[PDB]
């Protein structure tokens, strides 16, 4: 069993799910026509695809993923591109007008528009699940449908399903560079409502992956596609324990118990250790102890924040490939003997480990090199609170004059939720201050 | 090599690349179905 349902909402969600599902078809034998090649075996064969693919009576496989957007443009290259025959037609839901970088458009007028259809499609996709682990949400904080419609979607998902695991993946607002100018409003309003409804919110941002592709990979001028490929590698490493044999398995429920200590601190940061080019793999080892240390390097983080500016509350190391557990234990033991890496008092253990045997695959035309070992690091740190300070300052700069608000109050939203969301984020900042103080 | 089965007398096959698992123990209408296995780890 062990089925997972992916929900890609927004332009960022769809362009991430393209890379993710190309990857998923590459781990197994699934081709873009929707079928494997021919039988190769008398009678039964592999069934590792049941994590993500539902298979009909003939040999065709359908992804367990709902693609949602309010704009028809981004989804239509999936309907006409290479993977048009793989997806069920009713699995790609579009609107006619988008949210136009407006939270209330995506939550009150066009959000409640299409939320019933995707809920029905989720019900139909969850009816094929003999054993269902949890839902995966891919969205961006700066969007209108990635912020408004995702919030309402997880809201009604918590209403209709109860305590099903909702691991969400977010593209955080970068500190310096940004696209929209109403982006802090959307981030504030999408944190205020999903502060509870998300079980654990795995987060990345575009600027840190830009820096990674600049320094680690040897590509000047990366685009969104390389970022989507790295995010897809992270998601493949996260769920690899449900599909491949390993020495220490991990389910989707274990992340929320080993990473979320308190009912509001559920924003860990992702890291991928051996992201190096093929021109630099010729020279160096990729050993367990060498690339375990590369996870805790500040320059290799996938969120533009300094781990030296806070304390590590918990970690979730997801090893992958030819990893010897003795080297894992030695590397994690020698991590704790450093003063640059500091841990909180009330977590003497700190680490949750996982070992998988299947090495990462090679996407043709990709950037990463073929390696035997890979680490996906999930760190919950107090150093995220300096990003909330910057976000709060960005909201308070243009909330003092109340700019770009007539697009929100005028259309289907009162004004009091702005003040309420500011109170909620300020309370979260004080909580992050409280949990970082040592009980000496 | 006909060695005794003692702690340490095991040597892994490093040329093996596929590590896929099957769903031998699945489900049905309401019943914990159990299937006889036909493939090992990797699909062989």
């Amino acid at each position: 069993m062990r089925e997972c349902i992916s929900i890609h909402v927004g332009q960022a969600g769809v362009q991430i799910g393209n890379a993710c599902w190309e990857l998923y078809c590459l781990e197994h034998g699934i081709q873009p026509d929707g079928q494997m090649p021919s039988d190769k075996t008398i009678g039964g064969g592999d069934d590792s695809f049941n994590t993500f693919f539902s298979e009909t009576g003939a040999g065709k496989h359908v992804p367990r993923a709902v693609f949602v957007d309010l704009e028809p443009t981004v989804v239509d290259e999936v309907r006409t591109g290479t993977y048009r025959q793989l997806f069920h037609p009713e699995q790609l839901i579009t609107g006619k007008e988008d949210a136009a970088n407006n939270y209330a458009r995506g939550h009150y007028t066009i959000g409640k528009e299409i939320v019933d259809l995707v809920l029905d499609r989720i019900r139909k996709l969850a009816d094929l699940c003999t054993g269902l682990q949890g839902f995966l949400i891919f969205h961006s904080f700066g969007g209108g449908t990635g912020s408004g419609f995702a919030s309402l979607l997880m809201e009604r998902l918590s209403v209709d399903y109860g305590k099903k695991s909702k691991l969400e993946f977010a593209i955080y607002p970068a500190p310096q560079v940004s696209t929209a100018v109403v982006e802090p409003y959307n981030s504030i309003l999408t944190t205020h409502t999903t502060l509870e409804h998300s079980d654990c919110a795995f987060m990345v941002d575009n600027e840190a992956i830009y820096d990674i592709c600049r320094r680690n990979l040897d590509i000047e001028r990366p685009t969104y596609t390389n970022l989507n490929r790295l995010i897809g590698q992270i998601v493949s490493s996260i769920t690899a324990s449900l599909r491949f044999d390993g020495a220490l398995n991990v389910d989707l429920t274990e992340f929320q118990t080993n990473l979320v200590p308190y009912p509001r601190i559920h924003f860990p940061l992702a890291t991928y250790a051996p992201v190096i080019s093929a021109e630099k793999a010729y020279h160096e080892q990729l050993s367990v102890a060498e690339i375990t240390n590369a996870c805790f390097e500040p320059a290799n983080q996938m969120v533009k924040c300094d781990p030296r500016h806070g304390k590590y509350m918990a970690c979730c190391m997801l090893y992958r490939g030819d990893v010897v557990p003795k080297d894992v234990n030695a590397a994690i033991a020698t991590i704790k003997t450093k003063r640059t890496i500091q841990f909180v008092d009330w977590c003497p253990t700190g680490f949750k480990v996982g070992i998988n045997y299947q090495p990462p695959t090679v996407v043709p035309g990709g950037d990463l090199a073929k390696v035997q070992r890979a680490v996906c690091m999930l760190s919950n740190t107090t150093a995220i609170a300096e990003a909330w300070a910057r976000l709060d300052h960005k909201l308070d700069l243009m909330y003092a004059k109340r700019a770009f608000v007539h697009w929100y109050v005028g259309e289907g939203m009162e004004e009091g939720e702005f003040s309420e969301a500011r109170e909620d984020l300020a309370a979260l900042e004080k909580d992050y201050e409280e949990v970082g103080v040592d009980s000496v | 090599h006909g060695l005794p089965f003692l702690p340490g007398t095991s040597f892994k096959d490093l040329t093996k690349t596929a590590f896929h698992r099957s769903q031998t123990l699945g489900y049905r209408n309401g019943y914990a179905v159990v299937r006889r296995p036909t493939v090992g780890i990797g699909g062989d």
Binding site: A19, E22, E77 | -
Partner: peptide, 24 residues
């Protein structure tokens, strides 16, 4: 399909056949 060289998603996501890894 002329989108192999006209759009970003086409050059990014088009099918190149995978190669069998381990040499004989």
């Amino acid at each position: 399909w002329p989108n192999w060289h006209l759009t970003s998603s086409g050059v990014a996501h088009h099918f190149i056949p995978p190669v069998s890894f381990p040499p004989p």
